[PDB]
Structure formats: structure tokens, C-alpha cells
């Protein structure tokens, strides 16, 4: 069932889906794409994530493949005004001689300095709408000028329903399993495959890219599961010593993370937010924020970190 490109080793690009069905998508989304390929003609479309690797630029090529379009594929950042005047006007005006929908795929078109090109395109789209249609791919919509969103069906990715997420995940697990059969990767514990999917959910590219790096040993066993669910750096020793309100331990961990402070302080905010009660949140930002703020006035940085710990130990009421 699975398309393999075989000119690539890089493996998240080896398994890039050929057709709209091979693609793992939300139900309504897949159905709307089937609907489109059915009518045989392709409208102007925008696909956007903003979460990378949800399949935007893959489904772009697939849509073309299904309707058998004559398709020019173009790097967004390469598509400046002189390109549209030049190469694209040529293609859009020329007649495909098998009677194929002509389609211009502009990938990752959300760059800011192309707004001039995008406006120039708004007039173009109406002039050449009879021949050929445009499929834009973007990570961030606001980088697509409003009159281009007016002219398009804007389809929005990787923001599935609670049910879609549950189905999509099953579908992705089935797929990974199938990729493993093909690749010679032994699955000892299915739990690790369900874990890789869940871990990186919206992003299907990283979820496959992961599989490559945990396959060093050709097998996925309970031992790999520890590294997949496990946290390689973490904060745990501090978070725990904080809850326990002990000090000698906090006093000792200070020098450890004083090393790079701006990063540590960041994690601590991110990680404590989840682990503490609602008005402890508001207190924790005032405490961490103030501490971060004077860092770099404070002369002994290791001490300044100890001071932060003592402060949070006392005032944090833990859920």
C-alpha cells in the first residue's frame, strides 16, 4: 500500500505518501479532498498548519497526482514578482496538450517580503482562472495577504477533533507498523510505537524521523520504551526537592544549574506551571520573573539561584 521513493535515505522523505488516500488526515478533511479529486478540477486552495509536518505540502502534490494535473512546483521564497511575470505567466497562459488541469504549487509562501509578489498574484488569479489553479502552502496564514485568502478555499490542518485525533493516531500506528515490516525493524513492544505517535502528535514528520533514531539497534523493545517515555535532561530533582521543601538538597542543586541560567529559569516556569495550584501560578511568575530580572546585577549567580529556590519552596502550594 505504501509509496517508497527509494532515491532517498533520509526516510521521512522515503515514505512520503503518493496519493490522497495514503495520507493520514482528519475524516472531514480527507473527505473534502476526495470530493475535490472527484469533480476532476481543482480550485485555488491554501493549506496551512501552523504546526510543521502535518502533511500540507504532501497533500499538495497528491491532489495534483489524483486529478493528473500538469503541475509546476515552486519554492515560495523563490517566487518573487519577476518570477510570476516570467515563468508562471508563461506556464499559466500555455495550453497543456493532453487537456490536463494546470496547477501551480507554491510551497511555503508565507514569507513577509513576498507580499509584493502576492498582490501581483491577486490580479493574475482571475485572469488565468480558466486554465490553471494555484495551491499555496503556508505555516502561518497572516503571511498570506487577505485578498488571496478571499480567492481561495482555506483548509486548516493539524487541528483535528478529539475523535479525529484518536483515529488519526490509530492510523499512524498502523502505518508505522507497516513501515517497520518493510524496513526490517523488529517490534518487540507495540507500546513503544503508540508512544512515539502520542509523543509528537501533530507532526508526522518528526514522528517518523524519531523511528530512524531509535532503530539504531534494529529492534524496539521495552528498553527503548524507557528512552521514548523518559526525559533526557529534565528538571525532576529540583521539582521534587521543591515539593519536599527541603533545603540542603536545594542548596546543593543550585551550582548545578547556575551553569546556564536563562535556560533553566525558563524550564522551571514551564514545568512548575502544571504542577502547582492556580494562585500559586500567579505567585510563581512574580517570584521567578523578579529573580530573572535582576540576574546579571546579582554578583554571585549560584547564590541567586539558591535564593530563588528558598523563595519557591515556601510559597508554592502544590496541587
Amino acid at each position: 500500500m505504501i509509496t517508497v521513493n527509494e532515491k532517498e535515505h533520509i526516510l521521512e522523505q522515503k515514505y512520503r505518501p503518493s496519493t490522497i488516500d495514503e495520507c493520514i488526515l482528519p475524516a472531514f478533511d480527507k473527505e473534502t479532498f476526495k470530493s475535490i479529486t472527484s469533480k476532476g478540477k481543482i480550485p485555488h486552495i491554501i493549506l496551512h498548519s501552523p504546526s510543521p509536518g502535518t502533511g500540507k505540502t504532501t497533500v499538495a502534490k497528491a491532489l495534483c497526482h489524483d486529478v493528473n494535473a500538469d503541475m509546476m512546483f515552486v519554492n515560495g521564497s523563490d517566487c518573487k514578482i519577476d518570477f510570476v511575470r516570467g515563468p508562471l505567466t508563461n506556464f499559466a497562459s500555455a495550453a497543456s496538450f493532453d487537456g490536463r488541469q494546470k496547477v501551480i504549487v507554491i510551497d511555503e509562501f508565507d514569507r513577509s517580503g513576498l507580499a509584493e509578489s502576492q498582490r501581483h498574484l491577486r490580479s493574475f488569479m482571475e485572469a488565468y482562472s480558466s486554465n490553471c489553479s494555484i495551491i499555496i502552502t503556508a505555516n502561518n496564514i497572516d503571511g498570506i495577504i487577505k485578498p488571496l485568502q478571499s480567492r481561495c478555499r482555506v483548509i486548516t490542518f493539524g487541528q483535528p477533533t478529539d475523535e479525529d485525533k484518536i483515529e488519526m493516531m490509530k492510523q499512524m500506528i498502523r502505518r508505522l507498523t507497516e513501515i517497520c515490516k518493510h524496513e526490517g525493524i523488529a517490534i518487540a513492544d507495540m507500546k513503544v510505537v503508540a508512544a512515539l505517535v502520542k509523543k509528537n502528535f501533530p507532526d508526522f514528520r518528526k514522528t517518523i524521523g524519531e523511528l530512524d533514531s531509535y532503530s539504531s539497534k534494529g529492534v524496539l523493545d521495552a528498553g527503548i520504551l524507557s528512552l521514548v517515555t523518559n526525559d533526557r535532561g529534565a528538571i525532576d530533582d529540583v521539582l521534587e526537592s521543591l515539593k519536599n521543601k527541603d533545603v540542603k538538597q536545594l542548596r546543593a542543586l543550585a551550582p548545578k544549574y547556575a551553569a546556564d541560567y536563562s535556560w533553566f529559569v525558563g524550564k522551571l516556569a514551564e514545568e512548575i506551571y502544571s504542577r502547582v495550584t492556580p494562585q500559586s501560578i500567579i505567585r510563581m511568575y512574580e517570584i521567578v520573573g523578579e529573580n530573572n530580572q535582576y540576574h546579571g546585577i546579582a554578583a554571585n549567580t549560584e547564590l541567586h539561584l539558591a535564593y530563588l529556590f528558598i523563595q519557591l519552596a515556601c510559597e508554592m502550594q502544590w496541587k
Binding site: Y285, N292, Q293
Partner: protein, 186 residues
């Protein structure tokens, strides 16, 4: 206008097929339509206590702080992220505000002052000729009405109104009503 049968080719089709780009351009310029933002669904969530979670959308510590800066119920919380918030994650600065500023509502109008565009040009002028910063310059104008007759001095300085200087005062053809205005009644 010969031929006398043309299903009118739209403004665009003519621009392009004929390939004069200057007409294609003004056809481009047609939709420039500049507006954007949706920062008020972020303010709204901090207020109404709905859920956004940020991350995905662009965030402005300046824009969120200023918006809330309106209603005194908030100032305590904004005051906070103002002293302390410099140096917090946008993710954080947001999470905080969620858990501090409590009620919810606000209606729109910010407070912006009323500029007498003329009075500003006049102070901006005085501070130029006199190499003083703006507060003395205001003193000078108060003084310079009540004797020494502001027309005497505005007449000397009408000299430098250089239209680079006007761009510093207002932003529109209001700016050209001013070139003329102190070139006149002194």
C-alpha cells in the same frame, strides 16, 4: 474601440495579456487593503477566561499590556509584568495574566490625546531653533505669546518648515495644510 464585440476583458485580463506592467501594477495596487492583527481574541481570553493557549498566534507584550492598561481593575497585574515581565516567556507573560486580572469585560476606546497639530509644530519648531528639549520649548511658547509676540518669531522661523520636518509632525495631507498655515498670518 474597434471590433465592437468584446465580452469585456476584465481590468486584469487586459493588464496582463497586453503585458504593460505599469498597468498590471496599478491593478496589483488595487487590493493593497492593509489591515491585520486579531490580538483582541487574546485580550478577550485573558478577560473573559475562555481558552486560547497562545503559542500558535503572534503575541505582543506591548500590545497586550497596553490594551489592559485601560481598565484600572487590571493595572495591578500589568504594573507587575511591567516591572517584572521584561524577561518572561510570551508563553509566561500570557499564563500569568490569565491567573491575575480577574473579572471580565472591556469596551473598546483607548485613550489617546488630542493633538493640536499646529501647537506641536510650533513647539517642535522652537525646540529646534533654540536647542532645548521639549519642556522648555513649551515654556518659551507660553512666554512668547504674552510679549515678544509669537508672530515676530514664527515669522523668522517660517524659514525652516522643511517638508522633511513636517513628516515629523503629522502623517497626512493635514501635513500640507500646515506648510501654508504658518507661511500666512504672522
Amino acid at each position: 474601440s474597434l471590433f465592437k464585440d468584446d465580452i469585456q476583458l476584465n481590468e486584469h485580463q487586459v493588464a496582463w495579456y497586453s503585458k504593460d506592467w505599469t498597468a498590471v501594477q496599478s491593478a496589483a495596487d488595487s487590493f493593497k487593503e492593509k489591515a491585520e492583527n486579531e490580538f483582541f481574541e487574546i485580550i478577550g481570553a485573558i478577560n473573559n477566561k475562555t481558552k486560547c493557549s497562545i503559542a500558535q498566534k503572534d503575541y505582543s507584550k506591548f500590545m497586550v499590556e497596553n490594551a489592559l492598561s485601560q481598565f484600572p481593575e487590571c493595572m495591578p497585574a500589568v504594573y507587575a509584568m511591567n516591572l517584572i515581565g521584561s524577561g518572561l516567556s510570551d508563553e509566561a507573560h500570557f499564563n500569568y495574566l490569565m491567573a491575575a486580572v480577574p473579572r471580565g469585560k472591556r469596551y473598546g476606546k483607548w485613550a489617546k490625546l488630542v493633538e493640536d497639530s499646529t501647537e506641536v509644530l510650533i513647539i517642535k519648531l522652537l525646540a529646534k531653533r533654540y536647542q532645548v528639549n521639549t519642556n522648555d520649548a513649551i515654556n518659551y511658547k507660553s512666554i512668547l505669546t504674552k510679549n515678544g509676540k509669537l508672530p515676530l518669531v514664527l515669522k523668522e522661523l517660517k524659514g525652516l518648515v522643511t517638508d522633511d520636518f513636517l513628516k515629523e509632525v503629522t502623517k497626512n495631507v493635514k501635513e500640507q495644510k500646515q506648510l501654508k498655515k504658518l507661511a500666512l498670518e504672522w
